[PDB]
Design an enzyme around this catalytic site. Structure first.
Site, short mmCIF file in Angstrom:
data_model
loop_
_atom_site.label_atom_id
_atom_site.label_comp_id
_atom_site.label_asym_id
_atom_site.label_seq_id
_atom_site.Cartn_x
_atom_site.Cartn_y
_atom_site.Cartn_z
N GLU A 82 17.81 -8.54 3.77
CA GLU A 82 18.01 -7.60 2.67
C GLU A 82 19.02 -8.13 1.66
O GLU A 82 18.90 -7.89 0.45
CB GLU A 82 18.44 -6.24 3.21
CG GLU A 82 17.44 -5.63 4.18
CD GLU A 82 16.04 -5.50 3.60
OE1 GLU A 82 15.92 -5.26 2.38
OE2 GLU A 82 15.06 -5.63 4.37
N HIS A 140 -3.77 -0.70 5.33
CA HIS A 140 -3.84 -1.28 4.00
C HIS A 140 -5.21 -1.05 3.36
O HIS A 140 -5.31 -0.74 2.17
CB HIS A 140 -3.51 -2.77 4.05
CG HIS A 140 -2.10 -3.05 4.46
ND1 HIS A 140 -1.64 -2.83 5.74
CD2 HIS A 140 -1.05 -3.54 3.75
CE1 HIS A 140 -0.36 -3.17 5.80
NE2 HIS A 140 0.02 -3.60 4.61
N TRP A 154 -19.07 -8.45 9.28
CA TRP A 154 -17.66 -8.37 9.67
C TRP A 154 -17.43 -9.02 11.03
O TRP A 154 -16.58 -9.90 11.17
CB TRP A 154 -17.20 -6.91 9.67
CG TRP A 154 -15.94 -6.67 10.44
CD1 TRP A 154 -15.83 -6.32 11.75
CD2 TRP A 154 -14.60 -6.74 9.93
NE1 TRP A 154 -14.51 -6.18 12.10
CE2 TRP A 154 -13.74 -6.43 11.00
CE3 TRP A 154 -14.05 -7.03 8.68
CZ2 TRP A 154 -12.35 -6.41 10.85
CZ3 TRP A 154 -12.68 -7.01 8.54
CH2 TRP A 154 -11.84 -6.70 9.62
#
Ligand SMILES: *[C@@H]1O[C@H](CO)[C@@H](O[C@@H]2O[C@H](CO)[C@@H](O[C@@H]3O[C@H](CO)[C@@H](O)[C@H](O)[C@@H]3O)[C@H](O)[C@H]2NC(C)=O)[C@H](O)[C@H]1NC(C)=O
Ligand SMILES: *[C@@H]1O[C@H](CO)[C@@H](O[C@@H]2O[C@H](CO)[C@@H](O)[C@H](O)[C@H]2NC(C)=O)[C@H](O)[C@H]1NC(C)=O
Ligand SMILES: *[C@@H]1O[C@H](CO)[C@@H](O)[C@H](O)[C@H]1NC(C)=O
Ligand SMILES: *[C@@H]1O[C@H](CO)[C@@H](O)[C@H](O)[C@H]1NC(C)=O
Ligand SMILES: *[C@@H]1O[C@H](CO)[C@@H](O)[C@H](O)[C@H]1NC(C)=O
Ligand SMILES: *[C@@H]1O[C@H](CO)[C@@H](O)[C@H](O)[C@H]1NC(C)=O
Ligand SMILES: [Zn+2]
Lengths: 595, 194
Positions: free
Chosen positions: A356, A486, A458
């Site tokens: 961070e 996502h 797939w």
């Protein structure tokens, strides 16, 4: 009055208005996140609505000035960034439908619930199914949980996805983009800069070449993992076949970290953990960030402001105030940099603090630029800078210098092999999965896959590339790729591959320029001032220059090269070739657990 | 002893804006310059054209105190021959200047949590300012080929923005109070001696 000076005046107005509105919105959001009450939610929503309305009206106004008849490059980039209208081009009928579809998919994914045998309870995705997948070693339980979570969500999500694809394709067509895939790849596009030009098509070829170079190491790692998993499930796993999908240590197979306990090379040798030393030396929350700041000063990067120490939340409050403990780095604007994190006295929080702080250093570095040019060079630049710092802050040399590791510490080849094995699991497991998923979504958007092959293609691609095979056959009712967060939240998924490559490119270039002798996986750039000034050249460009130039500045070449990644894992490659002498390093599509 | 009206400027309660700064004329006075030291971290104490090494035992016919409030990053534009937006369209010092600029941090006084919109500055004007000129006129700026007519729509802009200080900003955006002590000695007068 030329158009150029009118655009200059418009942008001079826009910068001043947008900076203040953005600061107010970010401050409201920070207050909500560090104080979870409905009133703060109201304030945050109002500020976000104001910002959205202002941005929409400014984007509408900016189109009046033609993109042609522009000479200055920076103004052209700023106007092009502002002029992108996104989904506004869609009509009133279609926009509401698209918003409803997205909200419905998000709610359906969030409202997860799969029942269990004997009607014991009701298990959501977290923390029931997640814990079952992460910890259980029973074939039946994992298979049941995987199948239930797949079906209960995919059966509902299948009809919505086709309409979503059609609407997004129409929207992309309206914006002169061939399809949604082209729109997503348009984030790596550079125009009007000779020798620094990039195209949306070349990205696919670059990714394919990089993965083709990566493949042998992944094959060796996959063969080793299959050999080690043979012990637990001798009956269920073929020696020369693909691995079961539900036995990969997580719900989807994105990471292979949870398989470490089974596949640790040397169980007798322990890992390097300094939690006990930190506890014994009374390391508090502030000390960790103090040491991170000391490290960044060592690299000769600037200090931390006096607003960082007074206003940040570097520990859980301890009061009744409810917070979100996800560690984030905040750049509110106008000189306000903060970090939100529920720090605990552990080595993991040490590394997270370093990460961070690297993000905060990047934010402080690119502050000079205008408002519309304050971000990473591309979508994958911002996290590599954070990752390299946590790479440096884990070497035994750093932990010996800081006084945690004892001076008489002796490094073992076996311990280094174990560390490299864990790193290789975490870093290399996700690359084939990410590439395959993004390739499948690109093919779906381009229309090269008919609507009746969304599940045949797939699993065929998963068999060919990833090396994984479905446990049970699935028809078109199931939608396996839509179970991932996502995909269900309309998020680009190609920023987890380029980030991984860029991280190792940066960590090789900086270690080279820091005059280091030895294996790359043991490198420290602390107490080196050449690395700090070679890094500051890239961190202070923001989006002012093309990402090709920004990459060339730090590494030396204008292309994405996966050679440093293999250089990092050189010690592990030899060991995995030694251990896999007897076993067969390969997988065959034909065999399937269904038969 | 004609002690100068200092302590009524450095210790004021409301400095002005930078688009219409505040000018005070000091003359026929004794100018003690050891009162400044106790005021604040007066980190900007630049002096141009004279020597600030306690050489202020001379006599000057005129002293001009120009007071205003600006950002932390903009206190470097109060200098001879500078460019920006506090110089091009605001208080502009001449290329040859004989005075002392004192700028110090006043965050605790001029910054409110909700915001301090009392201070303003000018963003657009036709031509740069001649030295020591003031322009308080507020006419709708025109960047295009159409009359403004008194409405700020498209290509028509209001001239002056607002600083909107807050206590949580960085030091580069916190409010700094600036006082410029211009000196002036004409063809041999003996008015203000210190
Ligand atoms: C980066 O810079 C230097 C090494 O180049 C380190 O700072 C100080 O280096 C001196 C080396 O002469 C050491 O100080 C000595 O420590 C002993 C205790 O073992 C003490 O008794 C001596 O009087 C002397 O002060 C020490 O390494 C260090 N100073 C202190 C107070 O620790 C610095 O650690 C380097 N950083 C990294 C990450 O390598
Ligand atoms: C968290 O938010 C609550 C309100 O949602 C804050 O409580 C109020 O704080 C203001 C000060 O800004 C007081 O004037 C009010 O009396 C407080 N209560 C109510 C009901 O409004 C609370 O202070 C916030 N937490 C922190 C640490 O500031
Ligand atoms: C664009 O404008 C900026 C404004 O300062 C200037 O520095 C730069 O040289 C200009 N570039 C071109 C190509 O005109
Ligand atoms: C650290 O461990 C040693 C072990 O001998 C002990 O004597 C000492 O009290 C410990 N310090 C602590 C717990 O702060
Ligand atoms: C350390 O590396 C391997 C792994 O244990 C071992 O076989 C080798 O002998 C060791 N290195 C040396 C120089 O002995
Ligand atoms: C302003 O008032 C304070 C009050 O203590 C005083 O110390 C300071 O000298 C004054 N500033 C001057 C006289 O310039
Ligand atoms: Zn991060």
């Amino acid at each position: 009055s030329t158009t150029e000076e009118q655009a200059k005046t418009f942008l001079e107005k826009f910068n001043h208005e947008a900076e203040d509105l953005s600061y107010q919105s970010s401050l409201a959001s920070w207050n909500y996140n560090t104080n979870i009450t409905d009133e703060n939610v109201q304030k945050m929503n109002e500020a976000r609505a104001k910002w959205s309305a202002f941005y929409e009206e400014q984007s509408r106004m900016a189109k009046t000035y033609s993109l042609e008849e522009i000479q200055n490059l920076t103004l052209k980039r700023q106007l092009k960034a502002l002029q992108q209208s996104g989904t506004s081009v869609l009509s009133a009928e279609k926009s509401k439908r698209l918003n409803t579809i997205l909200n419905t998919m998000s709610t359906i994914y969030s409202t997860g619930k799969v029942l269990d045998p004997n009607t014991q309870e009701c298990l959501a995705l977290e923390p029931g199914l997640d814990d079952i997948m992460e910890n259980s070693r029973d074939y039946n339980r994992r298979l049941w949980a995987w199948e239930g979570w797949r079906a209960e969500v995919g059966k509902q999500l299948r009809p919505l996805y086709e309409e979503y694809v059609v609407l997004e394709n129409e929207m992309a067509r309206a914006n002169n983009y061939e399809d949604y895939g082209d729109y997503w790849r348009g984030d790596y596009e550079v125009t009007e800069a000779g020798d620094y030009d990039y195209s949306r098509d070349q990205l696919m070829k670059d990714v394919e070449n990089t993965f083709a170079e990566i493949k042998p190491l992944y094959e060796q790692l996959h063969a080793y993992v299959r050999a080690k998993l043979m012990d637990t499930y001798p009956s269920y796993i073929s020696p020369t076949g693909c691995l079961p999908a539900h036995l990969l240590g997580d719900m989807w197979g994105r990471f292979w970290t949870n398989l470490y306990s089974l596949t640790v090379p040397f169980k007798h040798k322990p890992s390097i953990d300094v939690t006990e030393k930190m506890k014994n030396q009374s390391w508090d929350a502030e000390r960790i960030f103090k040491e991170a700041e000391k490290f960044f000063v060592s690299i000769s990067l600037p200090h931390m402001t006096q607003g960082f120490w007074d206003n940040s939340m570097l520990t859980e409050p301890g009061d009744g105030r409810k917070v979100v403990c996800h560690p984030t780095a905040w750049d509110l604007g106008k000189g306000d940099f903060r970090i939100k994190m529920c720090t605990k006295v552990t080595m993991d929080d040490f590394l997270t603090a370093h990460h961070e702080m690297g993000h905060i250093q990047y934010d402080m570095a690119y502050a000079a630029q205008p408002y519309l040019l304050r971000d990473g060079a591309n979508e994958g630049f911002h996290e590599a800078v954070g990752e390299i710092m946590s790479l440096s802050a884990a070497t035994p040399h750093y932990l010996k210098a800081l006084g945690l590791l004892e001076p008489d510490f002796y490094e073992d080849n076996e311990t280094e092999i174990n560390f490299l094995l864990k790193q290789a699991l975490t870093i290399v497991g996700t690359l084939p999965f990410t590439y395959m998923l993004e390739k499948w979504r690109w093919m779906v958007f381009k229309g090269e896959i008919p609507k009746e092959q969304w599940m045949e293609k797939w699993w065929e691609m998963k068999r060919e590339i990833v090396g994984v095979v479905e446990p049970l056959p699935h028809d078109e009712t199931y939608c396996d790729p839509a179970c991932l967060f996502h995909v269900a939240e309309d998020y680009s998924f190609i920023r987890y591959y380029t980030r991984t490559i860029y991280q190792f490119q940066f960590h090789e270039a900086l270690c080279k320029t820091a005059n280091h002798e030895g294996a790359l996986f043991k490198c420290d750039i602390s107490n080196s001032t050449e690395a700090g000034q070679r890094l500051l050249q890239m961190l202070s460009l923001g989006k002012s220059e093309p990402w090709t130039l920004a990459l060339e500045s730090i590494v030396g070449i204008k292309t994405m090269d996966v050679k440093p990644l293999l250089n990092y894992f050189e010690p592990l490659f030899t060991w995995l070739k030694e251990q896999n002498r007897n076993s067969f390093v390969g997988w065959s599509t034909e065999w399937t657990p269904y038969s | 002893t004609n002690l100068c009206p200092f302590d009524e400027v450095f210790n004021a309660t409301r400095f002005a804006s930078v688009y219409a700064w505040n000018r005070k004329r000091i003359s026929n006075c004794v100018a003690d310059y050891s009162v400044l030291y106790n005021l604040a971290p007066f980190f900007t104490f630049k002096c141009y054209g004279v020597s600030p090494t306690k050489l202020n035992d001379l006599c000057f016919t005129n002293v001009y105190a120009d007071s205003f409030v600006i950002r932390g990053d903009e206190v470097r534009q109060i200098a001879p021959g500078q460019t920006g937006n506090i110089a091009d369209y605001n208080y502009k010092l001449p290329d040859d200047f004989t005075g002392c600029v004192i700028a110090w941090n006043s965050n605790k006084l001029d910054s409110k949590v909700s915001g301090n919109y009392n201070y303003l500055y000018r963003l657009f004007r036709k031509s740069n300012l001649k030295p020591f000129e003031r322009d308080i006129s507020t006419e709708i700026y025109q960047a295009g080929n159409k009359p403004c007519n008194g409405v700020a729509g498209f290509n028509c802009y209001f001239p002056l923005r607002s600083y909107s200080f807050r206590p949580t900003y960085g030091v580069g955006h916190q409010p700094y109070r600036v006082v410029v002590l211009s000196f002036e000695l004409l063809h041999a007068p003996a008015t203000v001696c210190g």
